[PDB]
Amino acid sequence: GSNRSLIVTTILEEPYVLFKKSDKPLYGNDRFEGYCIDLLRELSTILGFTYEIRLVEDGKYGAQDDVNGQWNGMVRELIDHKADLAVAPLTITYVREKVIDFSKPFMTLGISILYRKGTPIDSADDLAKQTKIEYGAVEDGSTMTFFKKSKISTYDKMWAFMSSRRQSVLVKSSEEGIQRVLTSDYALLMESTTIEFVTQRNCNLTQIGGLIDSKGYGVGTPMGSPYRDKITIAILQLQEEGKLHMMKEKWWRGCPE
């Protein structure tokens, strides 16, 4: 028979992946749009594959359980060969590299702070030393894991805060985190890429301070997948010819800065 379609896991996160609005019902792959959907399209034509997009069943990016070491999210879907690729804003980190493979990065970012304007707050240190303004991150994503494992004094203190208040400050999605910033005294620890999108849509919101780390998003594959190196080559081509730059400008398109 013919070559089977690759199963591609991904996750809803604007402007990387969203449900396309339309007047008539959309089915299958047609339901989705965004930067990572355009990226997937390019990879499919460059490499020559067909695909089926499936949103990660548990709704998570992926983190490790303390007791049994098991992963969840898109990372686990790859480990168990439930997906061939993860094409998503999936952060490349060493602990993830121990269990899945990544392409070279298609976008760079660092953690920063999303908050409201008109406060004196200027850095993570300003949050860490107090408990009136709450703060948190998306549960079972790389930002949460960054704080959970960091030995940096400020970040360790911030994790102590988040851990004891997990149910109230760790959030199910970035969208929910943004809602917390709009509806309570709350600052979200969010990746800088995503903050740039959010603050250009909502002129009430701003980034606080700079980037506290530096890393990239990559396409994930199960360990040993032959697709990983081929996808790296494709990403480099897309980068060199200006396509990734154009794609970012398209999806990131107020507000004064």
Ligand X SMILES: C[C@H](C[C@H](N)C(=O)[O-])C(=O)O
DSSP state of 165: T
Kindly state the smallest distance separating residue 109's Cβ from ligand X, in Å: 8
State the minimum distance, in angstroms, from the CB of residue 89 to ligand X: 5
Q: Tell me the closest approach of the beta carbon of residue 225 to ligand X, in angstroms.
A: 18
Rounded CA Rg of the chain? 18
**What is the phi-psi region of residue 224: left when phi exceeds 0, alpha when psi lies from -120 to 50, beta otherwise?**
left
Residue 188's DSSP bridge partners are 114, 136
CA pair distance 198, 159, nearest whole angstrom: 24
Choose between 217 and 227: whose C-beta lies nearer to ligand X: 217
User: Any residues with CB less than 8 A from the CB of 183 and at least 6 apart, and which?
Assistant: none
Identity of the residue, 49 or 180, whose beta carbon is nearer to ligand X in the bound complex:
180
Token duo for residue 21 = 């609005």
With CA atoms as reference, report the closest residue to 235 among 105, 108, 44.
105
Nearer to ligand X, 39 or 190 (CB): 190
232 binds ligand X (CB under 6 A): no
CA–CA gap between residue 185 and residue 169 (Å, rounded): 11
Check residue 218 for interaction with ligand X (CB under 6 A). Answer: no
Which residues sit opposite 32 in a β-bridge?
19
How far is CA 250 from its chain centroid? Answer: 18
| CA–CA gap between residue 26 and residue 34 (Å, rounded) | 15
Closest approach of Cβ 129 to ligand X, in Å? 22
Determine if 138 is a binding residue for ligand X (CB under 6 A): yes
Nearest distance, CB of residue 9 and ligand X, angstroms: 12
How many residues lie near ligand X (CB under 6 A)?
12
Q: If you write DSSP's letter for every residue of 44-93 in order, what string do you get?
A: HHHHT--EEEEE-TT-----B-TTT--B-HHHHHHHTTS-SEE-SS-B--
Please say which residue, 70 or 237, places its beta carbon nearer to ligand X.
70
Residue whose CB is less far from ligand X, 116 or 216: 216
Residue 141 engages ligand X in binding (rule: CB under 6 A): yes
43 near ligand X, rule: CB under 6 A: no
Q: Which is nearer to ligand X, 34 or 141 (CB)?
A: 141
The least CB distance from residue 131 to ligand X, in Å, is 22
Q: With respect to ligand X, which residue has the nearer C-beta, 16 or 49? A: 16
Only one of the segments 31-39, 43-51, 84-92, 115-123 lies at the binding site for ligand X (rule: CB under 6 A); that segment is 84-92
Helix (H) or strand (E) holding 221: strand 220-222
Judged by CB under 6 A, does residue 174 bind ligand X?
A: yes
As a whole number of angstroms, the distance between CA 159 and CA 155 comes to 6
Q: What minimum distance in Å lies between the beta carbon of 1 and ligand X?
A: 35
3-state secondary structure of 161: helix
Q: Which stretch binds ligand X (CB under 6 A): 24-32, 79-87, 125-133, 141-149?
A: 141-149
- The residue ranges that bind ligand X (CB under 6 A) are 61, 89-91, 137-138, 141-143, 174, 190-191
